[PDB]
Ligand binder design. Structure first.
Ligand SMILES: CCc1c(O)cc(O)c(C(=O)c2ccc(OCCN3CCOCC3)c(OC)c2)c1CC(=O)N(CCOC)CCOC
Length: 211
């Protein structure tokens, strides 16, 4: 019931670089995940133009940011197009991406890690701040799946039994011990304002009552 997959070698190499390189500007992970959510929302909106029943799984197009200081998790959920199981396996770890090698070669030539999203691999910037990432996703054409990886060269995929999501993708960042600033309301607001000011979907930052 839990399938384990190896990352393609260049993706494993990229994840190691992101994990081991000294780089203080870690807040760009949030811009990259919000960007991915925006792209997925653009896609379901586009498909709904010619087939409105594709919104039968939910008409609201939005992005929610949910910090949990108890679990030490930051969750990003969107109601975009979501991913099939094949989407997860093909595009979240087993296949090359010409952008993966291009990015590592650009880094070799002096580029900055913050350029990662130009190479189509911005998701992996999550590993700047997370020791483990869980991705829960639901596409209209498939069931709900959970992808998960703590790097180390492998990821798992399983059918997900948790709260049904309707449609979309939820990224759960299990934060590293020294990266808990990204659970603070003021810090998240600062990052969204700086980097995601023009995203064309409502971004709601959930709050927590103190301890
Ligand atoms: C976990 C990262 C993430 C996220 O944080 C929030 C999200 O909502 C989703 C999505 O569900 C999503 C679904 C479809 C998308 O676009 C389909 C068409 N395009 C055409 C060009 O070529 C690619 C597909 C898409 O665009 C960003 C995102 C994802 C997944 C994701 O970003 N992926 C890109 C690769 O990451 C390394 C995986 C996409 O597999 C389909």
């Amino acid at each position: 019931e839990v399938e384990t997959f190896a990352f393609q070698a260049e993706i494993a190499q990229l994840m190691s670089l992101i994990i081991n390189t000294f780089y203080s500007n870690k807040e760009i992970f949030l811009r990259e995940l919000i960007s991915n959510s925006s792209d997925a929302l653009d896609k379901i909106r586009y498909e709904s133009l010619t087939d409105p029943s594709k919104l039968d799984s939910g008409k609201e197009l939005h992005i929610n940011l949910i910090p949990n200081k108890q679990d030490r998790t930051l969750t990003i959920v969107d109601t975009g197009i979501g991913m099939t199981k094949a989407d997860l396996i093909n595009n979240l770890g087993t296949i090359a991406k010409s952008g993966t090698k291009a990015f590592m070669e650009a880094l070799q030539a002096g580029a900055d890690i913050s350029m990662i999203g130009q190479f189509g691999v911005g998701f992996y910037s999550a590993y700047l701040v997370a020791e483990k990432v869980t991705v829960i996703t639901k596409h209209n054409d498939d069931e709900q799946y959970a992808w998960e990886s703590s790097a180390g060269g492998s990821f798992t995929v399983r059918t997900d039994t948790g709260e049904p999501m309707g449609r979309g993708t939820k990224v759960i960042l299990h934060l590293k011990e020294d990266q808990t600033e990204y659970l603070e309301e003021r810090r998240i607001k600062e990052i969204v304002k700086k980097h995601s000011q023009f995203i064309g979907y409502p971004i709601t930052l959930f709050v927590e009552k103190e301890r």
